[PDB]
Amino acid sequence: SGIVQQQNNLLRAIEAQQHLLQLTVWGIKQLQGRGGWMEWDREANNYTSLIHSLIEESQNQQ
């Protein structure tokens, strides 16, 4: 709603995106089996859903 609340929302979104970014950096390093990627997939999907919720929330608060 307010400026502060929105600022906090944006920061949380950035924090979640950083976690996803770190997962991709790690994944690329590993590529330098499928089943061995199960946890990575789980995390990537969970953070993607988390970021989606954060963006929608931010959009709703203008």
Q: Applying CB under 8 A, which residues contact its own copies?
A: 3-4, 6-8, 10-11, 13-15, 17-18, 20-25, 27-29, 31-34, 37, 41, 44, 48, 51-52, 55, 58-59, 62
Tell me, what DSSP letter sits at residue 36? G
Find the shortest distance in angstroms from Cβ 17 to its own copies: 6
Return the exposure string of 16-36: e unless at least 16 CB atoms fall within 10 Å of the residue's CB, then b: bbeebeebeeeeeeeeeeeee
Find the shortest distance in angstroms from Cβ 44 to its own copies: 5
